[PDB]
Design a protein around this ligand. Structure first.
Ligand SMILES: [Zn+2]
Ligand SMILES: [Zn+2]
Ligand SMILES: [Zn+2]
Ligand SMILES: [Zn+2]
Length: 119
DNA sequence: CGCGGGGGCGTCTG
DNA sequence: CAGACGCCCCCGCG
């Protein structure tokens, strides 16, 4: 089970062996969302299973909003919110309804999900 | 009702 | 592995 292990996983819940550095880099991605960090704040006590999740969450406390709109100059702290809001200025509404008499279009999957719950 | 704003998660690239 | 991009999901508000 380890008589030949060019590489191993660095996650303490795994520590299994691998042979291709890249194929192990791919395996490791599964564990990148299994590392329980915690907030550093004295006004928080949350835990995040990824560095990016914690780093994103930190912005909620710092108030930092580096993603600024080119149109209305609004400021956001998540690229997903900014790109979503971008579609509001771009008129990009690809989430059209599939019901037998509607086809109403939204710029967000969840907006379409709520709309469908109205049917 | 349209959209802000946080949670969780897969994933390519570095 | 981590940093960064993209989405789905859920909730709250004017
Ligand atoms: Zn592993
Ligand atoms: Zn926090
Ligand atoms: Zn804008
Ligand atoms: Zn519909």
């Amino acid at each position: 089970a380890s008589e030949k292990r060019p590489f191993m996983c660095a996650y303490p819940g795994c520590n299994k062996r691998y042979f291709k550095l890249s194929h192990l880099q791919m395996h490791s991605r599964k564990h990148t969302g299994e590392k329980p960090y915690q907030c550093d704040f004295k006004d928080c006590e949350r835990r995040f299973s990824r560095s990016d999740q914690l780093k994103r969450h930190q912005r909620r406390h710092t108030g930092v909003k580096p993603f600024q709109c080119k149109t209305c100059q609004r400021k956001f702290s998540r690229s997903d919110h900014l790109k979503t809001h971008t579609r509001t200025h771009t008129g990009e509404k690809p989430f059209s309804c599939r019901w037998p008499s509607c086809q109403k279009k939204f710029a967000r999957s969840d907006e379409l999900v709520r709309h469908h719950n109205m049917h």
